[PDB]
Amino acid sequence: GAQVSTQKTGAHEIHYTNINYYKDAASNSANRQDFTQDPGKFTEPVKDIMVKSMPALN
Amino acid sequence: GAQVSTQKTGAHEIHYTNINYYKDAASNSANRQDFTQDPGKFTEPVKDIMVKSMPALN
Amino acid sequence: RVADTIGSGPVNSESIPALTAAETGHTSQVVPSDTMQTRHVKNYHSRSESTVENFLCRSACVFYTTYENHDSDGDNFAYWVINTRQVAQLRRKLEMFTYARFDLELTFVITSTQEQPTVRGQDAPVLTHQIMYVPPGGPVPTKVNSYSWQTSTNPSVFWTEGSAPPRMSVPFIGIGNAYSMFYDGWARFDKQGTYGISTLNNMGTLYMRHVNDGGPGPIVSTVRIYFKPKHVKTWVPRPPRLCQYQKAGNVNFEPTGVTEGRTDITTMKTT
Amino acid sequence: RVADTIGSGPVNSESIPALTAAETGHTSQVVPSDTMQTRHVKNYHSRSESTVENFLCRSACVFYTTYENHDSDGDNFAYWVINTRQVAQLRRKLEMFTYARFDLELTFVITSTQEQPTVRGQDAPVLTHQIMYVPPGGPVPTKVNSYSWQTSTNPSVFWTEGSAPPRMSVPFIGIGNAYSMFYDGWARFDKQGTYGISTLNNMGTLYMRHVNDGGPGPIVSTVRIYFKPKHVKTWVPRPPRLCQYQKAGNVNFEPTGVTEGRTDITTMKTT
Amino acid sequence: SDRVRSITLGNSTITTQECANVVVGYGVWPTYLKDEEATAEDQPTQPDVATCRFYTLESVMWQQSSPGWWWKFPDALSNMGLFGQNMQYHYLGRAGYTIHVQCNASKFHQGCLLVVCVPEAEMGCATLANKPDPKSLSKGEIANMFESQNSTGETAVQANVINAGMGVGVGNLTIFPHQWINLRTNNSATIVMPYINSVPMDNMFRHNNFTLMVIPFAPLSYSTGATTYVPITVTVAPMCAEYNGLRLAGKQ
Amino acid sequence: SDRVRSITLGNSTITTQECANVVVGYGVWPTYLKDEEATAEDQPTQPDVATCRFYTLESVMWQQSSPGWWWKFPDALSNMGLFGQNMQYHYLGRAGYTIHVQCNASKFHQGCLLVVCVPEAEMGCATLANKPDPKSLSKGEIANMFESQNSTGETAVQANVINAGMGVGVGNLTIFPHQWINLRTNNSATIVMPYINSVPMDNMFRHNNFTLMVIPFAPLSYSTGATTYVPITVTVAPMCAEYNGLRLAGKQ
Ligand SMILES: CCCCCCCCCCCCC/C=C/[C@@H](O)[C@H](N)CO
Numbered sequence A, B: 001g002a003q004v005s006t007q008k009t010g011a012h013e014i015h016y017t018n019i020n021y022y023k024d025a026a027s028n029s030a031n032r033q034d035f036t037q038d039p040g041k042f043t044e045p046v047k048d049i050m051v052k053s054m055p056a057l058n
Numbered sequence C, D: 001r002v003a004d005t006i007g008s009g010p011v012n013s014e015s016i017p018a019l020t021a022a023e024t025g026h027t028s029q030v031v032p033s034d035t036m037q038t039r040h041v042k043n044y045h046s047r048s049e050s051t052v053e054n055f056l057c058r059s060a061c062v063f064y065t066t067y068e069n070h071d072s073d074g075d076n077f078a079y080w081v082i083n084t085r086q087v088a089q090l091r092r093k094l095e096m097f098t099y100a101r102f103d104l105e106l107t108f109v110i111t112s113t114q115e116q117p118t119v120r121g122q123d124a125p126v127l128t129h130q131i132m133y134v135p136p137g138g139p140v141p142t143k144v145n146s147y148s149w150q151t152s153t154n155p156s157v158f159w160t161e162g163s164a165p166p167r168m169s170v171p172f173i174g175i176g177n178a179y180s181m182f183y184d185g186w187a188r189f190d191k192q193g194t195y196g197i198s199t200l201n202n203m204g205t206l207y208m209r210h211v212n213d214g215g216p217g218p219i220v221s222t223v224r225i226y227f228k229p230k231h232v233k234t235w236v237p238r239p240p241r242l243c244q245y246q247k248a249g250n251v252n253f254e255p256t257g258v259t260e261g262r263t264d265i266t267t268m269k270t271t
Numbered sequence E, F: 001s002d003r004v005r006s007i008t009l010g011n012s013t014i015t016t017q018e019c020a021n022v023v024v025g026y027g028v029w030p031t032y033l034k035d036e037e038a039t040a041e042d043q044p045t046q047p048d049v050a051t052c053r054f055y056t057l058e059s060v061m062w063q064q065s066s067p068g069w070w071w072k073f074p075d076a077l078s079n080m081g082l083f084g085q086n087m088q089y090h091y092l093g094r095a096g097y098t099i100h101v102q103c104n105a106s107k108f109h110q111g112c113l114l115v116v117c118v119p120e121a122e123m124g125c126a127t128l129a130n131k132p133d134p135k136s137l138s139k140g141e142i143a144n145m146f147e148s149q150n151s152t153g154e155t156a157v158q159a160n161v162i163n164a165g166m167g168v169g170v171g172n173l174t175i176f177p178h179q180w181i182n183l184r185t186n187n188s189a190t191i192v193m194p195y196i197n198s199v200p201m202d203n204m205f206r207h208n209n210f211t212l213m214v215i216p217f218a219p220l221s222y223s224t225g226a227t228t229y230v231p232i233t234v235t236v237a238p239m240c241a242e243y244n245g246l247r248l249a250g251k252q
């Protein structure tokens, strides 16, 4: 059960391969490839949206 | 995801096998098999071609 | 990956992007294109290295202590009650978040040194150490040869000198749904007693010793302990620690200035 | 692979291959067949070994320094501000190109030696070293036991003696689109200040030390640093360095003759 | 036909009666910066015809003892009309150039010049422990000169021609884009240089980019009676010049 | 919404909190010269973002006795960055402008300015047998001022406001593109002026084209305590500027 992922390659111009050998998920290597991103939680917690090109205070 | 390439064999008379084990392309071995070659950049940068059998200065 | 800057040109509208009301507690989502003529740029920059995991996922010394081959009873063995607050570096990083959940990769760097009352023909066989983890409640050792070192249940590592840093992985062993880096509360319902982060701290103790018994010449060994969070999840970000740390068990601080100063609000001379 | 020499015979034409005009700044593409009777030769010679990658891709010492087990405060630890210009060999190779882009494979050879005030019963446990890389701006160590050695974020290697050269790979960490080997410009817009390649040089500093604290007898360790470019791309080739090097931070040279001389333009005696 | 030539840029035309070809950069022809290669986000100015035209620098006289001359670009053009004005008002800029070196003699005259454009020509100081000074490096539109003996100076450029001021064999300057002006056949050299640098754009005051070097490998020579005044003129045209980061003007 | 406003030209943005509309020329919006309307044959330079941006002139203070001020365009911009540099190097040029006059007061303050752009504002001399001098006509980016009594001067402009320096009823300046800044409602005026002239292009030094006039018809007034320092700032942006006839720089 080998897993083939993608290496960090760079941008203006390849895969790896991993097999887990231990019975415990804690033994696994790092999740260095998780790129989820949601600023909205902290940057726009306002209940009434807020459009940019609009008069902020009506 | 094993990659099979060709060894430097010699000419007047075979494959390898590589698996990358690291998440970063920088960890990979050398690109010792890249044989691109273009002298034209330095040997003939002249705008008007230049044929060999011809009178260089017309 | 980051955003491309989309080309924009002249404007003459009644849409006012630059003007907002920060009172709302909302950060403006303005970009260059909104206030100037922009050219198009295909941006390839990635935010790979600021991911919480890559930020915390590098081994960091959290402590070290020493013990001696021979010399008797304090000296003989050492112990440490596990906690991540005795070091500035790591502690400040974890503390950029209120709660966190993660696995750990422990690595130990163990080194030995000779002490002065030397002796002749001193030729010591290689040293093997034992580190034992004693979960809260387990019978703790009282001298280098207490019965508890038989570890029928506590986990321990036996490692010999010269052979590469022993290492293990430990799961999220917390009893809550996350490790709390802050706790504005007390341990007792009557508020008497301890207050603060220490009320939560109960992760056990590490115990180390030499295995080969004391030889002629005295030797001192130091055990450096490394923590590396893995499989990290972090909630409720907070301001980075400003004031230096004073105590390991609380947030006590000496008031300190918000920044370094400069001569006037007009000085371009970077400090 | 190289070109076959195609067989050719007698000629009596008004096509003149041998006559050109080098003024054009164009190198003639003549081959034997154009000026003599050639036989056919199937050439199997390959140019595999002159590929830029195979040329640069061999580990080369770029520096070395020393530090001591005991002795206090300069001696105790060492540091090196990374640069590839303090050695003749590598420096001249990279310098055959104006710009280059590549990854690196660092290998360290660390060796230790005993110093004379010996002591009796000297029997030292194996030594473990620590090398720490401090990116520009990071708090730098001031003595063998400064807080910065806890490396919660800077990368470091801990290596024990007798166990095979520690090694790592580092990406193209440049901030431009390539590393510049030359820079005919200044660091400041007013041209006051530094001039030349050093204006670009800001790759951080390496710091090394012993981990096991100082024992009776003094020991000195030397750290040799090896660089091996990998995944190489190189632009704008230039003439190889003629004059020997004088300084690490610039191209300063003592004028020197174009070649060795001989007695007359007629001497076949190879020097 | 084809030794003759005509080049029009802006409101300026150059004609040649006896050239070779036109050497082009490293085969690359100049072009504006692409969105995929760009990093500075502001909309660039691309004046065009007002800036990408032929500027004729000061002439220089070739004598039988001249070791050679050199000019640094963009520096040499920092005072030429609008190209220079744009350099002042902008933090960043980039451009390519068509360089046309002129030198007519007679049929009875002889000599041969190497005309090279050396990208990134960091130069050495005459005295090892110092750095040359701005003016020893570039006198603007005024050529600096190489010397036929070790230069001495406490802050001068080590200008002995044989090492081209760079510590290399002057005879190998050939891997750089060049042409020769062998009076016997030529009378001009035309070299188009694309923008070469390790960054998409750069400040035009603190970085020089490439240096034009004119070096006689066979000395001017002639019999008495023949005219002894043989000037070498240099006309250059920026190509595809764009600037970014407009603000007030100057260096600093 | 709609009294608020944002205008971006080049690397400059203007925002307004309380405007009227934006008055546009004679309904014409500025545009480059068409091949059918052109006569000068050389290819024009159309720098763009480097020249068509907002230049902010010197401010002026409105006092309860100020009769008015005036500035002449292109003159007022002859020293502003690249717009000015292009004016120098070129025989011909043409452009339109977005003029934004600023003046905030308080709610307790009162007053009302006429902001007009008078195309071709030939002015009369104070002394009938002379012609005013260049400086009485235009002090560059520095406003000239009208007076509330007959000006005397041997070479001065007859600046008594009531005839707007032109021999007409100041109250009829209204057939020219204008807006008012009645502090009670406004705080700025924005006027876009297309290029108006009897020729497709013209020299920018010897001809003025249009004059901006700011004239208070109801004087600044306020009760003691209220701030007495009420500046009037003028920010202008050339639009669709093209130049032709490049040569060396200067007037003459
Ligand atoms: C054989 C060796 C076994 C070693 C086992 C070590 C287990 C301890 C893991 C501790 C992870 C603790 C990180 C800190 C959490 C605290 O900040 C919070 N106060 C708890 O809520």
Ligand SMILES: CCCCCCCCCCCCC/C=C/[C@@H](O)[C@H](N)CO
Pocket (backbone or CB within 6 Å): D082, D083, D084, D104, D106, D131, D132, D133, D155, D156, D157, D168, D170, D173, D174, D178, D179, D180, D181, D197, D200, D201, D203
């Ligand atoms: C744990 C050890 C980590 C060690 C990290 C070392 C990072 C440094 C890599 C440097 C590659 C530099 C090669 C030289 C480039 C220079 O020539 C140019 N002046 C830069 O433009």
